[PDB]
Design a protein around this ligand. Structure first.
Ligand SMILES: *[C@@H]1O[C@H](CO)[C@@H](O[C@@H]2O[C@H](CO)[C@@H](O[C@@H]3O[C@H](CO[C@H]4O[C@H](CO[C@H]5O[C@H](CO)[C@@H](O)[C@H](O)[C@@H]5O[C@H]5O[C@H](CO)[C@@H](O)[C@H](O)[C@@H]5O)[C@@H](O)[C@H](O[C@H]5O[C@H](CO)[C@@H](O)[C@H](O)[C@@H]5O)[C@@H]4O)[C@@H](O)[C@H](O[C@H]4O[C@H](CO)[C@@H](O)[C@H](O)[C@@H]4O[C@H]4O[C@H](CO)[C@@H](O)[C@H](O)[C@@H]4O)[C@@H]3O)[C@H](O)[C@H]2NC(C)=O)[C@H](O)[C@H]1NC(C)=O
Ligand SMILES: *[C@@H]1O[C@H](CO)[C@@H](O[C@@H]2O[C@H](CO)[C@@H](O[C@@H]3O[C@H](CO[C@H]4O[C@H](CO)[C@@H](O)[C@H](O[C@H]5O[C@H](CO)[C@@H](O)[C@H](O)[C@@H]5O)[C@@H]4O)[C@@H](O)[C@H](O[C@H]4O[C@H](CO)[C@@H](O)[C@H](O)[C@@H]4O[C@H]4O[C@H](CO)[C@@H](O)[C@H](O)[C@@H]4O[C@H]4O[C@H](CO)[C@@H](O)[C@H](O)[C@@H]4O)[C@@H]3O)[C@H](O)[C@H]2NC(C)=O)[C@H](O)[C@H]1NC(C)=O
Ligand SMILES: *[C@@H]1O[C@H](CO)[C@@H](O[C@@H]2O[C@H](CO)[C@@H](O[C@@H]3O[C@H](CO[C@H]4O[C@H](CO[C@H]5O[C@H](CO)[C@@H](O)[C@H](O)[C@@H]5O[C@H]5O[C@H](CO)[C@@H](O)[C@H](O)[C@@H]5O)[C@@H](O)[C@H](O[C@H]5O[C@H](CO)[C@@H](O)[C@H](O)[C@@H]5O)[C@@H]4O)[C@@H](O)[C@H](O[C@H]4O[C@H](CO)[C@@H](O)[C@H](O)[C@@H]4O)[C@@H]3O)[C@H](O)[C@H]2NC(C)=O)[C@H](O)[C@H]1NC(C)=O
Ligand SMILES: *[C@@H]1O[C@H](CO)[C@@H](O[C@@H]2O[C@H](CO)[C@@H](O[C@@H]3O[C@H](CO[C@H]4O[C@H](CO)[C@@H](O)[C@H](O[C@H]5O[C@H](CO)[C@@H](O)[C@H](O)[C@@H]5O)[C@@H]4O)[C@@H](O)[C@H](O[C@H]4O[C@H](CO)[C@@H](O)[C@H](O)[C@@H]4O)[C@@H]3O)[C@H](O)[C@H]2NC(C)=O)[C@H](O)[C@H]1NC(C)=O
Ligand SMILES: *[C@@H]1O[C@H](CO)[C@@H](O[C@@H]2O[C@H](CO)[C@@H](O[C@@H]3O[C@H](CO)[C@@H](O)[C@H](O[C@H]4O[C@H](CO)[C@@H](O)[C@H](O)[C@@H]4O)[C@@H]3O)[C@H](O)[C@H]2NC(C)=O)[C@H](O)[C@H]1NC(C)=O
Ligand SMILES: *[C@@H]1O[C@H](CO)[C@@H](O[C@@H]2O[C@H](CO)[C@@H](O[C@@H]3O[C@H](CO)[C@@H](O)[C@H](O)[C@@H]3O)[C@H](O)[C@H]2NC(C)=O)[C@H](O)[C@H]1NC(C)=O
Ligand SMILES: *[C@@H]1O[C@H](CO)[C@@H](O[C@@H]2O[C@H](CO)[C@@H](O)[C@H](O)[C@H]2NC(C)=O)[C@H](O)[C@H]1NC(C)=O
Ligand SMILES: *[C@@H]1O[C@H](CO)[C@@H](O)[C@H](O)[C@H]1NC(C)=O
Ligand SMILES: *[C@@H]1O[C@H](CO)[C@@H](O)[C@H](O)[C@H]1NC(C)=O
Ligand SMILES: *[C@@H]1O[C@H](CO)[C@@H](O)[C@H](O)[C@H]1NC(C)=O
Ligand SMILES: *[C@@H]1O[C@H](CO)[C@@H](O)[C@H](O)[C@H]1NC(C)=O
Ligand SMILES: *[C@@H]1O[C@H](CO)[C@@H](O)[C@H](O)[C@H]1NC(C)=O
Length: 842
């Protein structure tokens, strides 16, 4: 009954004919073939926590002029530096339903990363997907929906990598919550567990939901993946061969490299054989001075436990990702910041406190990304309710209410890793953040607008001030705009009992009681919500005194300007909620696991709900919805008509057959153990730094590993060291990453007309849903969408395609995608429940 993860070996090696990777492969081959074993180990092993400048860094190869590779957070900003931008969070980006904006954000991020000397930007995020709305880090990702998220991953990645930086799809996989993600962190919170939470996911659910968006990332050409902290069926993701070897590298033919999350790598030989390619930040645990790779990897190659073909492939994947995005060994942008301090001068080697020099150049990489940020946040703002009060036009009297309207009195970067819920909520907390160059609060932008218009403007920037608030908002003609929030983030930070994950789905800082009080005192109350995910609006949303409600998510640096643009109709809102607003906590049907459920061993997160999370659950159970997935209003109206479906002629879905090549080796290495000894007369051994060298020619003593001495055959599973040609999986694509290319054959083109039946120009977000028709299938699933500009009175065409994959189901008996015999239907409309146009697939 304890969930089990099958062995899948050997770890697949790169394919020289993989489309998109052919040129990268050859550049990697020419480079890797020149390398000594120590130099290959330098590539694969991080230099340690705090070792130099970036969040993580590899060893350098200074013989060939390769500077150390810089791995830097975050998905929405370059973390821990200055003169960068802070972009809107993934969840706000997802809410745009706008491919172009997703690409532009990705590109701008990559430009900032490139300008700092970053090699790999640690984003975007398809895990967590959003199994449960209390998930602390859901806001870093995109949507609960696998299609929207998959598209957002692909667009973001294409942008970042077009800007010349490697992207990293994380976290792979099943890190849906922060509770019990790490042993030490759990123990310091009073949870005595010996291993991290295990996500136990059935094969169908894996293929149709959690894996799906990462496959889109693979097909978009993502250079790297990050394996998760958590386990999958009680094997840690970074040594999980089912995950890394089979699903990622075999079935979906991934050609890039897998890096560990920071302290997610727990074993040397076992992880490498299971598909891990880079150990970040390089040490066993932060500041340990030791590594599961480094010296140990050198020794494992020297003693035979790790084959040469395997380490050669790790270096090939790392270098091929580097070359794929256009980085060169000659013209590397120097690392021009230090993560560990904003000081211009300090130790290059931070943990060791050595090599004092200039470590921050304070390079301005912001360009004109401010206005792009302002635009994305406005387009990802969801108008949930409007009885006529919006847009605002020369109002007599604005009363802006709430702490979330105002500044953090200690400044927008006053708290490390954004760990306060003081002032306006620009982004959440944790590693998925960066330092603001500024943070425009609603109060600043709304005042300036009011003064320009001759509107009266007063604000009370506290949630608990009923005397003052009542006296203000109860006056004649007041338009009360109440800003309220909820917050969440990464598990290393805790605010008021919220350990990463949210304890509840209410507003913070007495937000709910504030909104009830203001709406009881003022019949023109407008509520703006800054939240990482849904909160329960049930007790107050239906008050007619609340004339409008907006969810503005995590807008990033231009918050105040974005919301003012929407409030006054400079942007006509089109953004759609990328999750469901349920009536209760229980209506969601999933929740965070807050208490260990397996004694002192690994807690078990059984995904018994299957694919029925968010709107799939709400539709199937008919649970209480306030606002459905894909819902959002505009200041105009739209009419749907004229649905048409054109059937395409396609060939049969043919199983992929044949063999891989035998695993190649690139270059050779000396057999003299003395050649691998630490070169002490060349440079000093730096404290806590992670090196490839042995301390002496005694291999056993050099390991410092009390269990040293066993061979692959007695501690790894069968075929872990098998470098012979391997049969291809029928679901794989021959030379085609992302699965059998026949999956992406277009089977239908769907079209419909959209007419703007109101007075003003606006964007519409038509959506395409499919009913796959089986009794265990969701009622409808998202399969396409667009964002289209329509003038008053104008008619525009929505056009979208359905691939074979889009109408298939994973058949676990077959281990492939099948189109089931059940009648499928197509729906098109402005939301998951406004299914205006319907037609059966012909
Ligand atoms: C879901 O999860 C959420 C996240 O975890 C969770 O959110 C949390 O909710 C809790 C509970 O609501 C929040 O904590 C509460 O915060 C309240 C507000 O605190 C601030 O304001 C107070 C009152 O301010 C007025 O009075 C002051 C002096 O008298 C003046 O200085 C002010 O200017 C202000 O005056 C105005 O209002 C007056 C009337 O109120 C009016 O006459 C006057 O004219 C004017 O209009 C301040 O006192 C308070 O200051 C404290 O804290 C600050 C730190 O910020 C310190 O600097 C101060 O020294 C001081 O200690 C804040 O600025 C609090 O009122 C509330 O306190 C009460 O409850 C706590 C419970 O722990 C008691 O310890 C405390 O003694 C109080 O008890 C009394 O009332 C309660 C409630 O009715 C009652 O049960 C109890 O028996 C007793 O009667 C509390 O601290 C918390 O902030 C939220 N967290 C986050 C992170 O946002 C949410 O609840 C969850 N939801 C669910 C459903 O599970
Ligand atoms: C976490 O744990 C999860 C739970 O265990 C786990 O999910 C499981 O994932 C594995 C794959 O990793 C699945 O294994 C398959 O099992 C198939 C049999 O499944 C039936 O029996 C099971 C046992 O009783 C049932 O549990 C299962 O029920 C599930 O599905 C039902 C609906 O179908 C549903 O009602 C249930 O509720 C439940 O959800 C089901 O009834 C088995 O067929 C399959 O074998 C193929 O694939 C293997 C590779 O894994 C091959 O080794 C094997 O040889 C088979 O492939 C060959 O044959 C196929 C057709 O028969 C061909 O299509 C293939 O191409 C292939 O053909 C080769 O051989 C031919 C000759 O024989 C030759 O001609 C060809 O050329 C070629 O060489 C596989 O073992 C398992 O079912 C999943 N279970 C569930 C519940 O989801 C999850 O993966 C774990 N996650 C992690 C991260 O570890
Ligand atoms: C050459 O040099 C190298 C480098 O110095 C030397 O390398 C060292 O070699 C020693 C052995 O001499 C290694 O110690 C051994 O490690 C193994 C693996 O430990 C890790 O994985 C455990 C889980 O194992 C399963 O899954 C992995 C894949 O993830 C797979 O490799 C295994 O075969 C096993 O597979 C089974 O389960 C799979 C998943 O479900 C299935 O798919 C599969 O079918 C199988 O059913 C895990 O438990 C372990 O976790 C512990 O340790 C980590 C720290 O590493 C800690 O974080 C955890 O909390 C746990 O405490 C690891 O992650 C391990 O299995 C061995 O343990 C057995 O044997 C010892 C006796 O030595 C017993 O005490 C144990 O109880 C158990 O029976 C053993 O610990 C060492 O890791 C390795 N060092 C490095 C840096 O790589 C090598 O020795 C040299 N060789 C020569 C000839 O010189
Ligand atoms: C695997 O990856 C690792 C990690 O990247 C590699 O390890 C590094 O290798 C490089 C090059 O082989 C080492 O750099 C050399 O460092 C020595 C020693 O410098 C230290 O000690 C000096 C003597 O006391 C001292 O003067 C130095 O201080 C100056 O420099 C620092 C650093 O920039 C600066 O902050 C200070 O203010 C000082 O200005 C320092 O404390 C150094 O002597 C070497 O200089 C060579 O080149 C210069 C010209 O560039 C030349 O003038 C010299 O004569 C000399 O030839 C060089 O900088 C580095 O120290 C290693 N890093 C660590 C952490 O140990 C490893 O090499 C990779 N292996 C493989 C196989 O690829
Ligand atoms: C090659 O790999 C092997 C493992 O395969 C590796 O051996 C391991 O090294 C670690 C780190 O040095 C050892 O763990 C340490 O043990 C000492 C006690 O003797 C502890 O002080 C350390 O505790 C840390 O974590 C604690 C939290 O629980 C903290 O309280 C404390 O402050 C420390 O931060 C730590 O547990 C481990 O015992 C060995 N394992 C084996 C099997 O020998 C070896 O170091 C690698 N070699 C190289 C050269 O990198
Ligand atoms: C919607 O907002 C309006 C204000 O725009 C609210 O109307 C106000 O309701 C209060 C409470 O009933 C009235 O206040 C006073 O109540 C005392 C009771 O002791 C009474 O004696 C006073 O004469 C006075 O009525 C207030 O007059 C009234 N204001 C207006 C302008 O009508 C309304 O209650 C809100 N509704 C909801 C459902 O939130
Ligand atoms: C809030 O309530 C006031 C009355 O308390 C409304 O004021 C009326 O507005 C209409 C126009 O819609 C005028 O013709 C009336 O003369 C106004 N009456 C008074 C007594 O001022 C106000 O419209 C309400 N606001 C909203 C947003 O519905
Ligand atoms: C944690 O549980 C283990 C048993 O797994 C026990 O031996 C240990 O004492 C516990 N930890 C603490 C700090 O009490
Ligand atoms: C706001 O700042 C104060 C420090 O002045 C801090 O104690 C408090 O926790 C912060 N509030 C929140 C909600 O993070
Ligand atoms: C709401 O109003 C009531 C009574 O008018 C007051 O006692 C309570 O403290 C107020 N709450 C907030 C958050 O303003
Ligand atoms: C679903 O619930 C709604 C009320 O929320 C109800 O009107 C409708 O009939 C229900 N549909 C079912 C059970 O199919
Ligand atoms: C290797 O030498 C360093 C001193 O430079 C020491 O701190 C470290 O523990 C040694 N490692 C082993 C495995 O003995």
């Amino acid at each position: 009954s304890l969930a089990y993860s099958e062995p899948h070996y050997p770890s697949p090696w790169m394919d020289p004919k993989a489309i998109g990777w052919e040129e990268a492969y050859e550049k990697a081959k020419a480079f890797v073939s020149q390398l000594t074993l120590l130099e290959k180990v330098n590539l694969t092993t991080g230099i340690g926590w705090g070792a130099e400048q970036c969040v993580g860094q590899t060893g350098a190869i200074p013989r060939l002029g390769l500077k150390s590779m810089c791995m830097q957070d975050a998905p929405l900003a370059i973390r821990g530096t200055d003169y960068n931008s802070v972009f809107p969070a993934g969840v706000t980006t997802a809410a745009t339903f706008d491919r172009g904006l997703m690409y532009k954000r990705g590109y701008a991020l990559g430009q900032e990363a490139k300008g700092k000397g970053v090699t790999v930007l640690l984003g975007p995020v398809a895990g967590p997907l959003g199994r449960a709305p209390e998930g602390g880090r859901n806001w870093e990702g995109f949507s609960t929906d696998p299609v929207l998220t998959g598209i957002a991953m692909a667009e973001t990645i294409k942008g970042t990598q077009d800007a010349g930086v490697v992207a990293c799809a994380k976290h792979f996989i099943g890190n849906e919550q922060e509770h019990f993600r790490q042993v030490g962190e759990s123990q310091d919170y009073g949870y005595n567990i010996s291993e991290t939470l295990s996500s136990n996911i059935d094969d169908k659910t894996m293929h149709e939901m959690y894996l799906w968006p990462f496959v889109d990332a693979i097909r978009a050409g993502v250079g790297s993946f990050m394996c998760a902290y958590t386990q999958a069926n009680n094997s840690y993701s970074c040594q999980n061969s089912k995950l890394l070897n089979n699903l990622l590298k075999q079935e979906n033919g991934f050609q890039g490299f897998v890096m560990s999350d920071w302290q997610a790598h727990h074993s040397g030989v076992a992880s490498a054989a299971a598909g891990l390619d880079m150990s970040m930040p390089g040490d066993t645990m932060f500041n340990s001075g030791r590594s599961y790779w480094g010296t140990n990897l050198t020794l494992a190659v020297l003693n035979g436990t790790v084959p040469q073909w395997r380490i050669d492939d790790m270096a090939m994947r790392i270098m091929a990702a580097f070359f794929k995005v256009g980085q060169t060994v000659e013209d590397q942008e120097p690392i021009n910041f230090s993560f560990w301090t904003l000081d211009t001068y300090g130790p290059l080697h931070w943990a060791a406190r050595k090599d004092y020099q200039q470590i921050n150049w304070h390079v301005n990489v912001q360009g004109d990304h401010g206005s792009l940020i302002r635009e994305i946040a406005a387009r990802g703002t969801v108008l949930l309710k409007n009885t006529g009060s919006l847009p605002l036009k020369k109002p007599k009297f604005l009363a802006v209410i709430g702490e979330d309207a105002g500044p953090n009195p200690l400044g927008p970067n006053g708290c490390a890793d954004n760990r306060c819920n003081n002032g306006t909520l620009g982004i959440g907390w944790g590693s998925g953040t960066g330092n603001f160059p500024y943070l425009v609060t609603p109060d600043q932008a709304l005042q300036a607008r009011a003064v320009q218009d001759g509107s009266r403007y007063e604000s009370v920037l506290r949630n608990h001030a009923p005397t003052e608030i009542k006296a203000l908002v109860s006056q004649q003609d007041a338009t009360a705009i109440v800003f309220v929030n909820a917050n969440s983030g990464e598990g290393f930070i805790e605010i008021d009992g919220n350990k990463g994950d949210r304890l509840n789905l209410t507003l913070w800082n007495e937000g709910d009681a504030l909104v009830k009080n203001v709406s009881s005192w003022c019949n023109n109350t407008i509520v703006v919500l800054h939240t990482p995910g849904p909160v329960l609006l049930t007790e107050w949303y239906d008050n007619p005194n609340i004339t409008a409600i907006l969810w503005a998510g995590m807008p990033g640096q231009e918050s105040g300007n974005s919301i003012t643009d929407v409030l006054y109709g400079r942007v006509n809102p089109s953004g759609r909620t990328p999750f469901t607003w349920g009536a209760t906590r229980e209506s969601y049907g999933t929740d965070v696991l807050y208490e260990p459920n397996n004694g002192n061993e690994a807690p078990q997160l059984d995904y018994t709900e299957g694919v029925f999370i968010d709107y799939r659950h709400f539709d199937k159970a008919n649970a209480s919805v306030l606002y459905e997935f894909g819902f959002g209003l505009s200041y105009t109206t739209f009419e749907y008509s004229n649905l048409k479906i054109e059937k395409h002629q396609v060939g049969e879905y043919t199983p992929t057959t044949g063999q891989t090549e035998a695993a190649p080796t690139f270059g050779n290495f000396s057999e003299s153990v003395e050649d691998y000894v630490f070169p002490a007369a060349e440079f000093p051994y730096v404290y806590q730094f992670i090196y490839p060298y042995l301390n002496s020619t005694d291999m056993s003593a050099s390991s410092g590993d009390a269990q040293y001495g066993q061979t692959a055959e007695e501690f790894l599973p069968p075929k872990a060291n098998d470098g012979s040609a391997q049969p291809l999986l029928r679901s794989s694509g021959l030379h085609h990453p992302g699965g059998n290319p026949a999956l992406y054959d277009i089977m239908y083109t769907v079209t419909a007309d959209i007419t703007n039946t109101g007075k003003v120009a606006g964007d519409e977000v038509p959506q395409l849903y499919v009913s796959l028709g089986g009794p265990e299938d969701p009622k409808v699933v998202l399969r396409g969408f667009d964002r289209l500009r329509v003038e008053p009175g104008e008619k525009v065409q929505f056009k979208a395609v359905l691939t074979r994959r889009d109408v298939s189901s994973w058949d676990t008996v077959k281990q492939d995608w099948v189109i089931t015999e059940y009648a499928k239907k197509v729906y098109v409309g402005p939301s998951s429940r406004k299914l205006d146009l319907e037609e059966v697939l012909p």
